[PDB]
Amino acid sequence: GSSYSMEQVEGITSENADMFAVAVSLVSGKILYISNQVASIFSDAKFVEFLAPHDVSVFHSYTTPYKLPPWSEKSFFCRVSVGKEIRYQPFRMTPYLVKVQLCCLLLAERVHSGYEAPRIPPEKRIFTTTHTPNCLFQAVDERAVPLLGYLPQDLIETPVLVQLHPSDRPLMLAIHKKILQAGGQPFDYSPIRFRTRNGEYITLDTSWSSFINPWSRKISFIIGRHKVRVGPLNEDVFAAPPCPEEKTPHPSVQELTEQIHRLLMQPVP
Template identity: 30%
Template sequence: IGRYFIDFVHPNDRNIFASQVTKGLVTPKNTNQLHDEGQSQSELYSTLFCRIRRYRGLMNDFKVKGKSVNHVPFQLKLSFKNISDNDGTNIFLVIRASPICSSFEVPNEVTKNDVSFIIRHIADGTIEYVEPEAVGYLGFLPQEIISKNVLQLYHPEDLMYLRQIYEVIVKEGTMQRCKSYRLKTQNGEYLKVETEWSSYINPWSRKLEFVTVKHHVVEGPTNPDVFQMVTANNEPKLTEEQKIKSQTLIDDIIRTMNEVLTKPAEIAKQQMSKHCQEFASYMENFWDDLMKTDDESPAAIHAPENKNNEEDSIMHGLLSSYQYFSDSVSSTDTSLS
């Protein structure tokens, strides 16, 4: 009591914690209006994952400084609460912390139910989104895995197969659930997943923007504690030749995502060309019809100058442009009930 909570948060997670306290509560995930005394007037909360320091107890002596500092992953739910007393109203930050445990209990555990999580990465392999459900299976917190290169998480021996998958994705746009391959966890081990693949092609640049993967967990890692940090003892050892081969395959996959002409992009190009041709043909026919109307209307051309004939101006397009505009607006607007 009396200590700052942020002192117990892992140093690498303090920025995300401070950011969620400010930004997360401005755009809350849930709002329930409450008016009971002691309750918050607006129950706004924000969730995040972070590691909290484990308590170092006094066992046989008072040498606490010599003991190693361990942090445990938690999911936090943050909210503000107004409490009134004789001194006035004070605002408190309420933190509900739930420990996060590994989703696996035994080595190489085979999943009985269909469990999955989604990861999205851009064309150079950089991860830009991961579902919270992935935390218990990979051992990485969202802020740890975002901005990592997903290709570095693939097992080196599976990169040859994955290069073929990315070639199919880039050319076809999607791929159904593939056969199993290995994905690295926080502790340096690998779990087995089967993946559904999809991609987004920018219709203007006709280049691949990002790939969305839905991983179905098939088998857990040899070490079921996915949150255990990698050490020199459990870090996978690769020979220099294996490292060069892995990096070559990774470079090939990145080159495939950025250079290979995709089938969806070619379809988008053809559709855009077709629309342009149709529009040009429409404007050409419209102009020809308008010229014919002018040639076949001598009365309108030789009309007396002192006669103000609105109908002639309508026929010559002064009002038809407005009418076309108003019709197009009415066809796209949606009435509000």
């Protein structure tokens, strides 16, 4: 029972040159309050209009009322652009429910490729991935965005094998065999090459594990903890690839995929 609004929405973080705050009407979608420095790192309309069209559905999902925590991790990513081809910049955002009418304030921080000053120490370039037996990503942890160039939503529900170098795909078959064989005990395997947003591959040192349904004994998820031992040749992992986007065919990928899923259908006694 408290409405900040007006200037009470103040709480500068600068004193980051890459952050900004914004309050958005939960009913209108209109930008009620917008923090300064925005034009710097680059209005008054619907905030979604400045987001990549693919990230709009994402923004609404994570800003849904029955979610979010009242102002006194639950953060998502969005590419923002002050119009223009158009130029976007990835932003990590944390949503907070706040009254002005109850809206939603968000702290947005510009994200930087972990391969460029300030470069993420190699011993800490660690991210994890989770996937279902059908081999489609289920989640990618936040540490992955800076090391891959993709935002979580770009990889969720897509073939795991597609991101792997074509010569490291058949390896996945043996990796899963050991995974259900290991019955949950993590094990190392390297190197595996994983494709980033800019079409460049990074070399990973991976530890594999699985979550086993105790009642059915069937594997529910495959979890990997990755350490990028060799980053890409081009440090800006968010740039675009000079290749005609992705595709659909995936001749061998489909084959290898169903082959693995079949394998993971067996109970792990």
